Design a protein around this ligand. Structure first.
Ligand code: PEE
Ligand code: PEE
Lengths: 191, 197, 197, 320, 316, 197
């Protein structure tokens, strides 16, 4: 049993990585649902209101749905759980890297530094690209030849859920990086 | 293992309460991921952003397609449904997971007794925050939901009156959840006093 | 373990009946989660909030969208369907969970004799309550349910005649569930008879 | 566990048939839960509530919404579909559960369970005893193995006295076999008589003209022939089960299983003192002979008293 | 249960093929359960119950509701689609279940299972006994080890007497393999001569003219090609299975399994009176040869009375 | 078992990559059974199998039933889509099974050294063939498919501009696969050098 040589930071990171995998599985299940985006045209042809007749079939609506999923929605907004799953696989692979490997000190600080830089890169990229998960999307695909409308407004059904999942994911990686930075401080504070 | 002598009846009771809270969270998340939606019909005759609510009977033609209806349902599901009514299963999942981490803290972490003392303070203060936030927001879930998203440029109407089908379920789930939390907290509260005396 | 000598014949059969009731419970819960809904058609002829029910045949044009139909189903599931017909699998879940908690409390806890006698009395009175409370309400699960929700300002009708598809199958569950409870009480009767003799 | 010695080939056959039967039940159950439906189409031209069954051709308009059509499918699925086509998998699950409970009924019944575990334990540990090898070989006896052989002799005499009085296990196995064969007969009867009611085409007359406009509809049940062939397959399984059970019942009536004879073993061996056991002893010894005669041959020595005298002589020489 | 030494390479390969056939059957069955739909469109121009197939194009309106289409789909999927194209996954379920039952019959048949576990247990006991190593390398003998060595010799003698008499295991394996080969032949014949009936385009003529207005319909079967692929793939595996099975039968006619020759083992060793065993004992010795002849070499020294003599004088 | 310590680091790396590429194949198969469709919209201006493309905007009426759309999509999917895009997951599933079976064939059967020779050679040659065939056909996983079947006798159109929905993701999935195999191939070449050392 290596639990004696497993301090609190390693066990905390293990449980956090399990949480990462659970979050990624939940996000993949969210992406499993067929109904992803819902698109309606713009400028479509007490006061009584009347519904606007878009003059569109079901399959035309589905076509605009997938087209605006293609060319208007952000790639991170479409594969955020995908990146989450890949990156937690990387986390559990390189979390036991020192265990699965002055050479002892060397590979231990190598593991800590690799974990720290992965954490920092994840923080930078997530903080940069998290704002792109929006509900109201403006889509300007050129399918006027088939539908008749050149501009569309769409809604991403689970965009709020992806933003909340990204907030929880960022909190988890934040605790991860705080405990790993404490590990690095303890390692490099003394010889 | 042989830790049942180190696990007294309050730790086992809180563990079982946590298991029930976990499967409640799983049930809520499953319901929200599969069958959760809203069903919105526009208010045909409106009086200042308010539904006035007024030879045989014929169905009202809104002339909205099924897709426009889907758009209205999603848009009203975000901007007007109360956030607790949408994030209750994820909130209870997060609370259950943090309770599990707190209750199983010494099992993989007189310093042990002081650690349990700090653990009990943290767990009981989280119980206090949990019960306050849950009690204050249980009555903020309603079946019939008003909506004023101002999407007249896409469907032609402003105000909508939607139905949230599983909303009551969440309230009922939340209701049961309150009992569990209270039990958990009450049990934990005794432990604090049991170590205070 | 070695506690099988403390579990007589009646205990083994009651445990097996409890597992079988748990399978019935989870089957009903899965049906409620997945395929529970209603189909509600408006009544063209009405007489004071009641369906009047009054060469080749032709179809009746209700002049309603699909989504107004969905709203009618949701509102007549919330308002005019009996709560027991909606919550019977969940109540059976609660009964089975508390029944397992009562049956196996002395294993996880003249103290033992006191728990055993209390559990026997509780299980007999709980069987009586369950059989009475389920036989009383079992007629609320009907195939045809006439609903009247006053959504004329949003739909165009006042009365509808819903059909509940998974109702009668629930009946086939419920009676069978009751039958299992009957057998439980029968075993309990013999136990009490043995407790008298 | 080590109960497989008490289960002959017919018990293993019935256990596997019941497992396959349960698989059929679960498959049909998820089929009925998820994909079971009816596609009901109204008859435009009718004659006394009966479908008359009457320039390129063009389609026939019914003016029915999707919700009216769903109502028609639901109403003609409940009111005019045969109940067998709807609840056949649940019936199969019930029959399979009852068969499984009957098969393991003497296993969990405490009065027979105690006898069964005692018999299995002392039979296996008598097989493990080297006194059987030393005796059927015929001193070669250690103090410790002689002591445990004496203890096993005492245990065998005690169990023989304890189990000779009652034949409850034999009666329980009789009851299980008779219940299984009569349930096979009932299942075959009603399934054969009711399997003709699973048909693809159903003419439903549910009288919902006030809601849809048509009196009679013609419905196609998509999962009908499937629910036929499965049922036919199911019937085949039951037949096999019944035949197996029939043989078992015949095997428990050709000779008296409550009177065992050691004539072959005590004739081929030097010991002619081994008596004939009766009642439950005889029944479990017959069940073990259905596994192999070897277990009975190695336990017949421990059942003997001349072998006990020879062992006592060996221990007397060992101590003195 | 340590039965793996009794299943040769052909048995393991056939079990793996049956497992992957179970996988094929499960996948085909769940696809047929969930997404096996037929899409039937009527043909406007009829030519003696046959479809004529004749600036901006305009769509063809049939005036059919979404349920009328679902009814014609069900009718022409049931009546006119060939039965193999519908129940192929259930056929492969039944066939692979019967193949597995045939493979594990002698494992689960107590009359031969008891003999098999007896034989396995004594082979494993003789595998660890050190008189075997002393005899093959051909002395010190502890009292306990000499005791279980003589005891194991006596079990070997009694168990040879018990097993050599009958041939139930040999005849049951004969019956098993001949049933497997005849059923493989039947499977290949019917599957080969029926597989070509999986077709994507089917022209149905069901006479629902009173319910829809059209007599002849053209239907797409989107799960045909996949079934075709799976069918072909399934057929290929049976080929493999079939080939393997013939090998076993060929092996079981290559020489009489009811007799065994110890000529090589006793010729290379000093003990020259090792007797040639027969029947069930010879047959399971042959199977252990097909697994590892080292087991037969290790066991062969307990069958000679000369080794009994050497063990007696060493123990004396 | 008894083979835990024989494997070096590269064997464990190959096993991990094999597990990842296994569940990649399985998840692709789940996507293929679940949401594998493609939506064809008929071309309003067809001049000898060519889509010409020469107030408020308005939609286009194709006058096709939903079932004629279903027939068009099914026929354009099974007649005008490359086998690679349609059967990406079953083929990668076959590759997983064959790769894993060849990686563990010596367990199921210097004969061992020659067997592991043959298995390593098979592994590296199948890596090469898989890379070649995958990069040679990776271009056919594309969204836009101009299908042309000429079933105008049933639809009234002859060309349709379909767009495959689960393609680009499939593309990146395929991309992931090749990248994984690339590292696998790298490790494989190392093994080759070892067994050619
Ligand atoms: C011969 C029998 C052998 C065993 C077979 C057992 C039968 C299983 C019975 C059903 C299993 C799943 C129940 C599903 C019920 C819900 C149905 C539902 O929601 O709708 C069907 C739904 C939508 O379909 P359509 O609308 O036709 O698609 C759009 C057309 N382009 O269809 C689905 O795709 C169902 C969802 C997919 C999951 C079901 C399983 C399918 C097989 C999975 C293949 C890969 C699995 C790998 C196994 C992993 C093991 C480690
Ligand atoms: C031995 C029995 C026969 C062996 C092989 C010969 C097959 C001949 C089949 C008989 C035949 O051709 O008759 C047709 C008949 C049906 O005709 P259709 O064309 O549907 O009818 C249209 C007219 N209304 O065909 C059949 O019956 C096909 C037989 C195949 C099915 C056999 C039974 C297999 C059952 C599988 C069990 C499933 C278990 C699922 C459990 C999975 C675990 C969850």
């Amino acid at each position: 049993a290596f639990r004696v040589l497993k301090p609190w930071w390693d066990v905390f990171t293990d449980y956090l990585s399990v949480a990462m995998l659970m979050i990624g599985v939940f996000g993949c299940t969210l992406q499993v649902m067929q109904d992803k985006i819902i698109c309606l045209p713009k400028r479509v042809q007490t006061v009584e209101m009347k519904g606007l007749k878009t003059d569109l079939d079901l399959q035309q609506y589905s076509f605009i749905n997938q087209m605006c999923y293609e060319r208007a929605l952000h790639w991170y907004a479409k594969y955020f759980p995908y990146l989450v799953l890949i990156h937690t696989l990387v986390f559990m692979l390189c979390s036991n890297f020192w265990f699965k490997f002055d050479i002892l000190y060397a590979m231990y600080v190598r593991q800590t530094v690799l974990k720290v830089i992965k954490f920092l890169i994840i923080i930078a990229y997530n903080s940069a690209l998290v704002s792109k998960v929006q509900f109201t999307v403006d889509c300007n695909v050129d399918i006027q030849d088939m539908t008749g409308y050149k501009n569309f407004s769409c809604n991403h059904t689970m965009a709020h859920l992806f933003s909340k999942l990204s907030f929880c994911y960022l909190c988890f990686v934040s605790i991860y990086g705080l405990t790993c930075l404490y590990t690095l401080y303890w390692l490099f504070y003394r010889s | 293992p042989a830790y049942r002598i180190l696990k007294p009846w309050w730790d086992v009771f809180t563990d079982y309460i946590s298991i029930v809270m976990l499967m409640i969270a799983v049930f809520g998340g499953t319901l929200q991921v599969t069958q959760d939606k809203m069903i919105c019909l526009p208010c045909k005759w409106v009086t200042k952003d308010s539904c006035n609510d007024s030879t045989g009977p014929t169905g009202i033609k809104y002339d909205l397609d099924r897709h426009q209806y889907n758009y209205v349902d999603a848009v009203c599901y975000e901007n007007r449904l109360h956030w607790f009514a949408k994030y209750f299963p994820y909130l209870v999942l997060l609370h259950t997971l943090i309770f599990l981490a707190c209750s199983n803290f010494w099992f993989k972490f007189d310093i042990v007794y002081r650690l349990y003392m700090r653990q009990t303070i943290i767990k009981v203060i989280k119980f206090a925050l949990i019960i306050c936030y849950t009690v204050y927001y249980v009555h903020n879930i309603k079946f019939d939901v008003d909506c004023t998203v101002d999407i007249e440029s896409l469907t032609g109407y402003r105000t909508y009156r939607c139905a949230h089908p599983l909303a009551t379920l969440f309230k009922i789930l939340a209701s049961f959840y309150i009992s569990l939390v209270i039990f958990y907290g009450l049990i934990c509260m005794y432990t604090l006093w049991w170590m205070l005396r």
